Amino acid sequence: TPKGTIYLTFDDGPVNASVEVIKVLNQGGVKATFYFNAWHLDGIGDENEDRALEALKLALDSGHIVGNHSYDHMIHNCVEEFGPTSGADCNATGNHQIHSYQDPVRDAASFEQNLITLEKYLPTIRSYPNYKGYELARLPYTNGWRVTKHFQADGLCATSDNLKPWEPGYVCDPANPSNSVKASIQVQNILANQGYQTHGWDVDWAPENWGIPMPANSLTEAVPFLAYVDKALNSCSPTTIEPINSKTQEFPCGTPLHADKVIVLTHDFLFEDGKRGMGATQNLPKLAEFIRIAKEAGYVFDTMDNYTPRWSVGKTYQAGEYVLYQGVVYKAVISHTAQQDWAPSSTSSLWTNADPATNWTLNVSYEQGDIVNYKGKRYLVSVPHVSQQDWTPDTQNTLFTALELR
Amino acid sequence: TPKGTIYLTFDDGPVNASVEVIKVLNQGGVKATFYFNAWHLDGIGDENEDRALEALKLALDSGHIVGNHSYDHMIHNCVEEFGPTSGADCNATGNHQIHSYQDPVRDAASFEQNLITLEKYLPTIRSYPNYKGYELARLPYTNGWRVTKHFQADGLCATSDNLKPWEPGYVCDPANPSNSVKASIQVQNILANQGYQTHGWDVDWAPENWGIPMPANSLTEAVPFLAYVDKALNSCSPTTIEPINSKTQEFPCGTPLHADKVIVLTHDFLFEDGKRGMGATQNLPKLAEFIRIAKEAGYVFDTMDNYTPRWSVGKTYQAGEYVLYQGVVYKAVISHTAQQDWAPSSTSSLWTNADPATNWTLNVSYEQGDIVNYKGKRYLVSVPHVSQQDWTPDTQNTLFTALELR
Ligand SMILES: [Ca+2]
Ligand SMILES: [Ca+2]
Ligand SMILES: [Zn+2]
Ligand SMILES: [Zn+2]
């Protein structure tokens, strides 16, 4: 039995730096999850990205999981008019974390545009089972979670409306979050209703010092980082992680799906020799060494499509246990032994749909106080029940109470 | 038992004309399927479309099914640079059917852009179960079908590379189709791999004479059109329909899923008082009367989400019968009685996946000669089998033969 499971997740690719990152992973004998921004394929992401397509292809060919990080990392909210120079313009101002989210609909759409661009530059991408761009996502800047109906939480200070977390006079009030945060929360919900899961992170492999000309050089060494991983194991890191804009204040500590697991966040661009330092020369060895010693310590590596364990034939389940089946999350209604022909579904008596969505859905175990959307209207669940085709909110006024607005 | 089932399908909405069309359907006590182009919501589709959003909302609120007809009805292939006036520019040239399809990837993407725009103007649209924009589609100009693994066929002369079907010297060779047709075929396959079904039509409710100033006025009357529907019932109309660019030459006549059914194609814009004639004043009554007398003749009306019959608990199925379950097509492997807990799936022994796709998929009954895509490579099925996770094409060289290219 493993000491635990580590999920290496790389954000902001695909870029030139991604190629060697992938090769190190391959030599290390591990799979990882890449949350990509497709604008690098268009060559407007303001990075060394002429090999972007090559990297995307190598990632998928090597069997790594590809997830959705939005088309432009929300840079359209950093400038006045989004264009080919917007990435450079935002880097000049460094206002990434200010007004990061504004119109949730427009921002959520950025994730769908991502799919179009990916499927434009790599028309065969859907033929890869490890392509999960339409199932797995992660919001820029935001340690936010949409995993199950009862496993979700937001980064309540991920982004700001004025001051950056380090600037003098910065105030973070989780109870009354910024407009930007509120928008990101709505974005989470929109994506969840489109069938997405979203995952945050436990630990962030980043420079120990951003106050030097080559901060990438200060990336935590392998031995030290393993200690940080060890410390994160079963310690509800999302609540204690620093800085404050990386927190998930209301993360459900000790939640079964999170036990014995550590999700590592890092970025491809930290592993290249460039404007952030000698990341390739110095950090690629740190990655290779970490993988080796983590395995020596008894860790195994897995990908985010397995974070929620896939339904497996032969296994016994207890009522209340969660599984992932065909991209949909299910919770066991009664303890039983999973048979080939009795998989979870929208009609099974053995399972109920437990996706982290809010739109009215079939075979969900609804509880008093739950709020669902149905045909453009919001309804409150008044009495607990399992939803079925007959019991639509607009007809069942004993089960549902129509909510008023304004 | 019904004499048959009619599927009223309206293309090219949503526009002002759609509002009264929907009201007539509602008064008639029937549901219908609308294949929409979202560019009308942006106000660049060159129609009276200021009430476009109102119509979209009314269609969904009334319980009608909404399907995908692409964002701009492929008008970007009709002009040099697509813009707000492109719809008007294409109407000036009337080159809709020339070079209608060029880059299949770009064209297929038009269907995904459609979803973005729809979900932009109506952010609550996914809360409607009758919203099927991501499951049901129909290609502009093209009587093409992607229904099941063994139920698919293309409009081999739907579009041209030079001359229009009526112009002197026009040649249609189904055995060697135009470049435009070939592109539309690839588009069909791309959409199918994204989980879409596509449906053509049996009969087309259109003007009897386009050679007058108000052709809409000549729309077939109710009594006559019922006769045409009667004639289409179980007669493989897609092969005999006129004009030639509306044909489905290789349509599988007598195929079980098509028996006792007639899909009617028409357009919202034929029911408005405008540049095509007095469609509202004259044709809305024809629609209302047709619905009434069709019912009197013993027909029932259904929508395209039911064209492939939904899996139903309690019903017995014979091996070889097709069903639709959670948007996926399945074929019965063994005759049995459908139970609540034994629905179709990717692991069921009772059903196999029979979607009209070409990417390698789980639990599909593959036959010798079948060609699948897997991780960017094409493989030929050498020996018949049912696919499973272990038997991926890249490892099973007794089941699959890798194809070479160029
Ligand atoms: Ca999902
Ligand atoms: Ca489907
Ligand atoms: Zn990022
Ligand atoms: Zn059309």
Q: Which amino acid is at B234?
A: N
Distance from CA of A125 to the nearest CA of B (A): 7
Contact between A318 and B327 under an 8 Å Cβ cutoff? The reply is no
Interchain proximity A123–B113, CB inside 8 Å: no
Give the whole-angstrom CA distance, residue B376 versus residue A128: 7
> Rounded to whole angstroms, what are the CA distances from A102 to A79, A83, A97, A237?
12, 18, 12, 28
User: 3-class DSSP state for residue B166?
Assistant: coil
Interchain CB distance below 8 Å, A112 and B109: no
Residues of B with CB under 8 A from a CB of A: 57, 60-61, 105-106, 109, 112-113, 115-116, 119-120, 122-124, 126-128, 190, 193-194, 313, 326, 340-343, 345-350, 359-360, 373-377
Closest approach of chain B CAs to the CA of A295, in angstroms? 26
With b for 16 or more beta-carbon neighbours within 10 A and e for fewer, the A59-75 pattern comes to: bbeeebbbbbbbbbbbb
The Cα of A370 is separated from the nearest Cα of chain B by a number of Å equal to 15
What CATH number has the domain spanning B1-308?
Answer: 3.20.20.370
Residue A224: cis peptide before it, omega within 30 degrees of 0: no
| Binding-site residues on chain A for chain B (CB distance < 8 A) | 57, 60-61, 105-106, 109, 112-113, 115-116, 119-120, 122-124, 126-128, 190, 193-194, 313, 326, 340-343, 345-350, 359-360, 373-377
Encoded tokens for B366:
């593959």
Residues 6+ apart with CB under 8 A from B92: none
Ligand nearest to the CA of A100: 3
For residue A389, the chain B residue with the least C-alpha distance is B129
The phi, psi pair for A128, rounded to 5°, reads: -95, 120
In chain B, whose CA is at the least distance from the CA of A129?
A: B375
**Domain A309-406, CATH:** 2.10.10.90
Alpha carbon of B328 to ligand 2 centroid (Å): 5
Instruction: Determine whether B213 is exposed, middle or buried from the number of CB atoms within 10 Å of its CB (0-12, 13-18, 19+).
Output: exposed
Q: Measure CA B80 to chain center.
A: 27
Centre of ligand 4 from the C-alpha of residue B155, in Å: 14
Residues of chain B with CATH 3.20.20.370: 1-308
User: What's the count of helices (H) and strands (E) in chain B, helices before strands?
Assistant: 9, 22
Tokens of B38: 């979202």
CA A362–ligand 1 middle distance (angstroms): 14
Minimum-distance ligand to the CA of A195?
Answer: 1
Backbone φ and ψ of A11, nearest 5°: -110, 155
Identify which of B115, B67, B75 has the alpha carbon closest to the alpha carbon of residue B263: B67
Which residues of chain A are within 8 Å of residue B112 when distances are taken between CB atoms? 112, 115-116
Residue in chain B closest to A344 (alpha carbons) equals B341
Coarse DSSP helix, strand, coil percentages of chain B, rounded to the nearest 5 percent: 30, 20, 50
Q: Which two tokens stand for residue A257?
A: 């799906």
Whole-angstrom Cα distance, residue A265 to residue A237?
12
What distance in angstroms lies between residue A330's CA and the mean position of ligand 4's atoms? Answer: 39
Specify the domain boundaries for CATH 2.10.10.90 within chain B.
309-406
Long-range pairs for A87-91: beta carbons < 8 A, 24 or more residues apart: A87/A39, A87/A44, A87/A45, A87/A46, A87/A47, A88/A46, A91/A46
**B119: chain A residues, CB-CB within 8 Å:** 105, 109
Strand partners, B381: B400
CA B16/CA B70 separation, integer angstroms: 19
The ligand with the least distance to the CA atom of B305 is 2
Residue B349 with chain A: CB contacts under 8 Å: 340-341
Q: What resolution, expressed in A, was reported for this entry? A: 2.0
How far is residue A242's CA from residue A245's CA, in Å, rounded to a whole number?
Answer: 8
Measure CA of the first residue to CA of the last residue in chain A; give whole Å.
54
With CB atoms and an 8 Å threshold, state whether A376 touches B124. yes
- Point out which residues pair with B342 in neighbouring strands: none
Mutation for testing the B interface, residue in A115, A118, A122, A124 having most B CBs under 10 Å: A124
Residues of A in contact with B124 (CB under 8 A): 373, 375-376
For tokens 């951003």, name the residue.
Answer: A210
Residue A96 carries which DSSP code?
T
Contacts of residue B271, Cβ cutoff 8 Å, sequence gap at least 6: B17, B20, B21, B216, B279, B280, B283, B284, B287
**Beta-bridge partners for A5:** A261, A300
Q: What residues pair up with A374 in beta bridges, in sequence order?
A: A377
Name the pairing type of β-strands A33-36 and A4-11. Answer: parallel
Q: Report CB contact under 8 Å: A348, B341.
A: yes
Say which residues have a Cβ less than 8 Å from residue A41's Cβ, sequence separation at least 6.
A14, A49, A52, A53, A56, A117, A118, A120, A121
What strand order describes the sheet that includes A377-381? A371-374, A377-381, A400-402
Between CA B69 and CA B268 the distance in angstroms is 13
Closest CA to B37 of B121, B153, B152, B128: B121
- Which residues from chain B sit within 8 angstroms of residue A373, using beta carbons? 124, 127
The tokens of B84 are what? 């707000």
Resolved by:
X-ray
Does residue B252 contact residue B145 with C-beta atoms inside 8 Å?
no
Beta-strand runs (E) in B283-397: 299-301, 316-317, 322-325, 328-332, 336-337, 351-353, 365-366, 371-374, 377-381, 385-386
Give the nearest chain B residue to A130 (CA atoms): B375
Backbone angles phi, psi at B190, to 5 degrees: -65, -45
Residue B73 CB partners (closer than 8 Å, separation 6+) = B12, B37, B39, B45, B96, B140
Closest CA to A152 of A366, A371, A354: A354
> What is the number of the ligand closest to the CA of A354?
1
Best interface-test mutation with B: which of A116, A125, A358 has the largest number of B CBs within 10 A?
Answer: A116
